[PDB]
């Protein structure tokens, strides 16, 4: 759920084994997926992807470089 208007949005967690980093009710930085409003690839009707969790990037957590606070 976005902060700025309150809308409900489905977002795709990018890499393998990264959904466990996302915990219930956390701050997530969400981007577009890359087709400018058009649903991308396999996922139907889901056009956004999570970039950061709790102000730590998922790329660092997946690569095991940084640690996720709470």
């Amino acid at each position: 759920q976005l902060i700025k208007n309150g809308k409900k949005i489905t977002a795709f967690v990018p890499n393998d084994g990264c959904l466990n980093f996302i915990e219930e009710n956390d701050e997530v930085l969400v981007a577009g997926f890359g087709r400018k409003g058009h649903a991308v690839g396999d996922i139907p009707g889901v056009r956004f992807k999570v970039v950061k969790v709790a102000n730590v990037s998922l790329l660092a957590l997946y690569k095991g470089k940084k640690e996720r606070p709470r």
Binding site: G17, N20, E23, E24, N25, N55, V56, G64, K66, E67, R68, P69, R70
Partner: protein, 615 residues
Amino acid sequence: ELSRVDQRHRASQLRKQKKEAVLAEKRQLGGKDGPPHQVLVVPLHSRISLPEAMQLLQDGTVHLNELGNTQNFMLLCPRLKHRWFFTSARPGDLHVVLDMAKVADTILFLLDPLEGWDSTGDYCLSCLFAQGLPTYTLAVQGISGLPLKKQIDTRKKLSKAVEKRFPHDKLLLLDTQQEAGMLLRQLANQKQQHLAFRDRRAYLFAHAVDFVPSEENNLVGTLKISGYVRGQTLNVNRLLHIVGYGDFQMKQIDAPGDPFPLNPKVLMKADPGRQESLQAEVIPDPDEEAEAKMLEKYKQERLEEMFPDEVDTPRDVAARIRFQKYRGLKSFRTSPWDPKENLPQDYARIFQFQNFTNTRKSIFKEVEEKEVEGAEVGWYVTLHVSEVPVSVVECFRQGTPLIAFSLLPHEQKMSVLNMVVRRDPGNTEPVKAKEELIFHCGFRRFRASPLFSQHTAADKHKLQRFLTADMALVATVYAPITFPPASVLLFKQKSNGMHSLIATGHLMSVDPDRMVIKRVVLSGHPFKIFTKMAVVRYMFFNREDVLWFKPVELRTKWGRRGHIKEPLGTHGHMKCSFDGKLKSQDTVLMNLYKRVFPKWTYDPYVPEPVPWLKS
């Protein structure tokens, strides 16, 4: 929406609404009606002496409280209209930092100018991130202890050393009293992080604690926990938990005069007998040998990572006896398993919820949307406790603080907690499945024997016999029931009482219905191959062994799936059908599943940790 005035006026309405929400939030702390603002100070690096910054920060009207070891004081200023309570902690001593950093309102970290922080402070900060940050505020000390030439580059080097742990923060320095004025101004106005695990119960910090022994020989008496209520409206009927000494019943609340008002004896409640929460945790009606064992654990983990659960069938013990309570499954995901099929006497000793989510919603709405007749927040109250050991007061004289929080309904009973948890990369010691590990599960501290499982979405969860360094597991154990969310920490005695951190996470839903399945795969080398037919040896050793495990379907490391047709030899020689033809370098294997349950090893007492150090 049209009509530019209409869009503008709708935006102004929304602006008013969010400003009213923010203003309604920020008056809850540090004011005439608000309780004092508790600031906990940690000097991370070993070179920093906290008395130096502590006397730079103490000047405002001071009230120097004292303890056995730690020295915390009260600050009051009408200049900023702010009430402060500064409390100091030492890194490495994870007991004090952990049990009083979960009630502090803002944490101030001190950093040396030359290095980032100490390794012991690194351990402390890792644990503090893993259990929850109230509000961190970076600070340094030795910046003006150097000339300007190295000063600016020292700030550059510190900024380099911080971004790996704290993603981005300004480093606010402490050298003068005016700089302390800047810091106090900063800590007065911060974006306060609502740590909801504090807010959902009624937690209270103790400034005074008096023991009135009913009988001194019985070593138990009446306790006087007086301090500030910081959570919700605290009610007497709800039981009271002390973080290091368990949950128990409280008998009386009085409200005396506050010690430090911002602008300078009567009892509130006694507990009724019928409306009291009952203390019923269970149902009423019923040297080199250690190194060798560690190397054996290393070999077992190395065997149970390149091969999942390969167990060699013993040729001495009969196979259908040693796996008597195992069953076969065609497919792990789809084959049904009855959750109420085989239960021991241990699950006849816990408490089950018909619907956890409905109960959690009901309890949370009864806390939030309803008001109780207890004492409100910010009040300086006193609690008389009927039953308490003596030694806690002795601990109150040692240097550790006392924190008491009033629980939700149905939080004292025993249930089966499931903890989502992943391994900290700092430790690499192999931990077996049924080891005894210390859980810090959100104001609670206890040894337990958990069971590790996968964190998937399905019903059955395969038991993990070791802790994986990247996979996020579920630790399942009998434990006192706690309502999620909850920070969860895992420690182990390394040597001489040094609590080492292994893994951390959150508390998932609590239920005994989450079954854990232990698997055993039995290997066999196929020594004869026909087309879609195979004769395999060394899987069993008797003749009736194949007849007992007939309906279990064989699988194959190369992906073939089959089912056995006949036994041929008196020994373990076994005819098997297949979908296709096996390769010559292939092995067949059969899956056996049983239901496994956690051991009942729970005890609320925890030994005091020694200061942590690096090997």
